[PDB]
Design a protein around this ligand. Sequence first.
Ligand SMILES: *C(=N)C1(NC(=O)[C@@H]2C[C@@H](S(=O)(=O)c3ccc(N4CCN(CC)CC4)cc3Cl)CN2C(=O)C2(C(F)(F)F)CC2)CC1
Length: 219
Amino acid sequence: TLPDTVDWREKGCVTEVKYQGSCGACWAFSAVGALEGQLKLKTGKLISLSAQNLVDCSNEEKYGNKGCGGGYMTEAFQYIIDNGGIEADASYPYKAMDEKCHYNSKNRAATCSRYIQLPFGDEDALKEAVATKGPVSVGIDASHSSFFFYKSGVYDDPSCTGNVNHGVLVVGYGTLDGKDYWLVKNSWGLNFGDQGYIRMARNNKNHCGIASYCSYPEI
Ligand SMILES: *C(=N)C1(NC(=O)[C@@H]2C[C@@H](S(=O)(=O)c3ccc(N4CCN(CC)CC4)cc3Cl)CN2C(=O)C2(C(F)(F)F)CC2)CC1
């Protein structure tokens, strides 16, 4: 039986909200966010991991990531698996540009053995994973201006679609004033939403495609 409310921030499993700038690195922030959660759960250390390492080093046909042109959280995990590691943000900081890969194994801060994909559209499966596994990478339709107007409450825009376009991180869930929500960490800095987070409608027919393309890594 699952808890009614989850917030991984309260368990010390979520790092500071990052600022992607004008580089299309949402996917990279989503992926490192999920892996940060696992790293904390396994090792006890919370460390921001290198989104830039993903941007610079997985921009090739093998993965189909495009650096600042966008990419996939699953393929980010595959890169980390193939590479045998990823650096921390502190040693490989975010530049918001496509740069030549300069991964240094001496600076490895995390690994990935495999990743898990949840069933398409299944908000119950996402609830279970968030409750029991940790933060989960997801795709959403974040293309409507209302998304950037959000400040409080639960985002529930009838114009949202299942055609996703941005990777974000689900770090919890609950019910706010009778409305089920997913607690979502973005990568637009503190000024976005509620201190960088948005609560998005949950159990409302897979609203904004939030449970369409969910994945998480294993250390
Ligand atoms: C973030 N700053 C930006 N968005 C992206 O990088 C997104 C993240 C993901 S996604 O969440 O939008 C997405 C889209 C489609 C899938 N598919 C559908 C087709 N299936 C096979 C039939 C496989 C899964 C999964 C996900 Cl996670 C991809 N993003 C992109 O922008 C694209 C690309 F990666 F190619 F760059 C355009 C897809 C950059 C705004």
